[PDB]
Amino acid sequence: SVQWCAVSQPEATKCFQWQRNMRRVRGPPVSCIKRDSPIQCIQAIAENRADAVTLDGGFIYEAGLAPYKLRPVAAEVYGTERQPRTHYYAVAVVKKGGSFQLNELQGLKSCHTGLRSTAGWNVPIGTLRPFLNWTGPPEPIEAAVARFFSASCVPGADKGQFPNLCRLCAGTGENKCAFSSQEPYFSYSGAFKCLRDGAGDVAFIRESTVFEDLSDEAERDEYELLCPDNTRKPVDKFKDCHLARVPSHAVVARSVNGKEDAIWNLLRQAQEKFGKDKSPKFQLFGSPSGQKDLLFKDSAIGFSRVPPRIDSGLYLGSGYF
Ligand SMILES: [Fe+3]
């Protein structure tokens, strides 16, 4: 029986909901362990206290190094059901009717999904590297992006060490700039919320975020995309206007006694019984109102098995930072 690692209290509530719905229809069992961050779950999985967790590209990287050595066993599948993909597009959204392009971003206000995440850090900080005042190590990269943008919200960053990076974060007290749902500018939806609220000028998020979060068509029209050739196209044109195409979030397990057939059998049947438009009792790719992407991404349509003997580095693609 597969033990999933829940990162927050609403993830755990979904996990327990998942567990009782699996027992209800005679699927393979799933138990639940609770932890406070993605790194604690990576550590729990390698310490044999958990067996699975869905991670973002930046954390798939960190799970694949020693002493953890976690490996991707199942990628999340996005796109439509008639046209699926195991990849996403890191984009930079801004309010329409603007002067600026990608190269004139100095001194503006930035909204990020989190420190060391794919579309919100690794990708945009990599694309904007020529524009920075970086002389290389041992100076941390945070300090140079702290002089670039006048204020940001980069969740997970140091409030003491880089105060400018947490300034636009809207969390209260000990949650402001925290890497969790308690900070409301955290993740894809939170970073988009930071642009919507007029706090930042640009949000570095993925391509579907404005289609998810803005159900009303008039308001999606108020935003546009900053393409890397230095032009501005609309939000429906991400396929030609993006910072990078990045590999999808994957479930990671141990590379030694990882139980990956058990993990897959649980995922295939969970997708079959509780996928997009399957059951009205449980949704594996939906979350309750006010919460976003618990356990897996909302509106992902399924899973795809990673072939054997592929580690984190082979998964991430050659051409990573
Ligand atoms: Fe991501």
Curated annotation (Swiss-Prot):
Region (Involved in glycosaminoglycan binding): 23-28
Tissue expression per record: High levels are found in saliva and tears, intermediate levels in serum and plasma, and low levels in urine. In kidney, detected in the distal collecting tubules in the medulla but not in the cortical region or in blood vessels. Detected in peripheral blood neutrophils (at protein level). Isoform 1 and isoform DeltaLf are expressed in breast, prostate, spleen, pancreas, kidney, small intestine, lung, skeletal muscle, uterus, thymus and fetal liver. Isoform 1 is expressed in brain, testis and peripheral blood leukocytes; isoform DeltaLf is barely detectable in these tissues.
Post-translational modification: Poly-N-acetyllactosaminic carbohydrate moiety seems to be needed for TLR4 activation.
Effect recorded for S255A: No protease activity
Bactericidal and antifungal activity as annotated region, ranges: 1-6, 16-26
Site (Interaction with PspA): Q9
Active site: K69, S255 (nucleophile)
Residue sites binding Fe(3+) 1 per the record: D56, Y88, Y188, H249
MF GO annotations: cysteine-type endopeptidase inhibitor activity; DNA binding; heparin binding; iron ion binding; lipopolysaccharide binding; membrane destabilizing activity; protein serine/threonine kinase activator activity; serine-type endopeptidase activity
One GO CC term on file: specific granule lumen
S-S bridge residues: C5-C41, C15-C32, C111-C194, C153-C169, C166-C177, C227-C241
Keywords: Antibiotic, Antimicrobial, Cytoplasm, Disulfide bond, DNA-binding, Glycoprotein, Heparin-binding, Hydrolase, Immunity, Ion transport, Iron, Iron transport, Isopeptide bond, Metal-binding, Nucleus, Osteogenesis, Protease, Repeat, Secreted, Serine protease, Signal, Transcription, Transcription regulation, Transport, Ubl conjugation
Residues that coordinate or bind hydrogencarbonate 1: T113, S117, A119, G120
Biological processes per GO annotation: antibacterial humoral response; antifungal humoral response; antimicrobial humoral immune response mediated by antimicrobial peptide; bone morphogenesis; defense response to Gram-negative bacterium; humoral immune response; innate immune response in mucosa; iron ion transport
Complex formation: Monomer. Found in a complex with LTF, CLU, EPPIN and SEMG1. Found in a complex with MPO and LTF; interacts directly with CP, allows Fe(3+) incorporation into LTF and activation of CP ferroxidase activity.
Similarity section: Belongs to the transferrin family.
Function summary: Transferrins are iron binding transport proteins which can bind two Fe(3+) ions in association with the binding of an anion, usually bicarbonate.
Protein name from the UniProt record: Lactotransferrin
Organism: Homo sapiens
Gene encoding the protein: LTF
